[PDB]
């Protein structure tokens, strides 16, 4: 064998990771949306739930091609759990699945010079409340969220932690923490300085009414109730 290796592991000291930034046209979109200000528009709650269901809708069709994940049913469902300690609304599911090629192929910021056509329509026709529906701007969430982090766990593939928030600069780096096998963890970072957004009661009914009794299992986390379980919460200061 070679002469050991030790517990040392460092790819690059300088810069360390791979980052990119489209500071031009995409930065114009970003500046046009930030000047809209955080006026709170929960319309996105409907837009994103449609997108989430859309990804399960695709794998639903793919289940006819490959029924391997339909063999048992270990996952493949809508899990919506808010981590009060992490201030992140965690949406975890398997979805139809994505590969590393989909990421670099620009899963986001898919405007790329075609932004002018949409800009024209946005100038005289439609407003920003439709950009997510076209799948070219899921950054509509920035109106009520500040950071979006996507970590992918590996299984017969590689794993990466990709993120973005604003500006138009994103980063890709490999992960080294295994809390799951192979899953897409969508953690939405709440800007605590604006909204708690951790009202389990509203979130419970809001998804219930919007589901309209859909034929799929949903796992929603809640906050501590009172009976057998007990934990303190700081509401009064």
What do these coordinates show?
- By secondary structure, the protein is α+β, with helices and mostly antiparallel strands.
- The chain has a single domain (18-220), classed as Heat Shock Protein 90, CATH 3.30.565.
- It is built from five helices and eight strands; from the N terminus they run E-H-H-E-E-H-H-E-E-E-E-H-E.
- It has helices at 25-34, 44-62, 100-104, 115-123, 200-211, and strands spanning 18-21, 78-83, 88-93, 147-152, 160-164, 169-174, 184-189, 218-220.
- Strands 1-6-5-4-7-3-2-8 form an eight-stranded mixed β-sheet, with no helix packed on it.
Q: Tell me, what is the CATH class?
A: Alpha Beta
Shape: globular
Largest sheet: 8 strands, mixed
Radius of gyration: 20 Å
Strand content: 15-25%
Annotation field: number of helices: 5
Largest sheet: spatial strand order? 1-6-5-4-7-3-2-8
CATH architecture: 2-Layer Sandwich
What order do the helices and strands come in, and which of them pair?
Layout: E1 18-21, H1 25-34, H2 44-62, E2 78-83, E3 88-93, H3 100-104, H4 115-123, E4 147-152, E5 160-164, E6 169-174, E7 184-189, H5 200-211, E8 218-220
Parallel strand pairs: 2-8
Antiparallel strand pairs: 1-6, 2-3, 3-7, 4-5, 4-7, 5-6
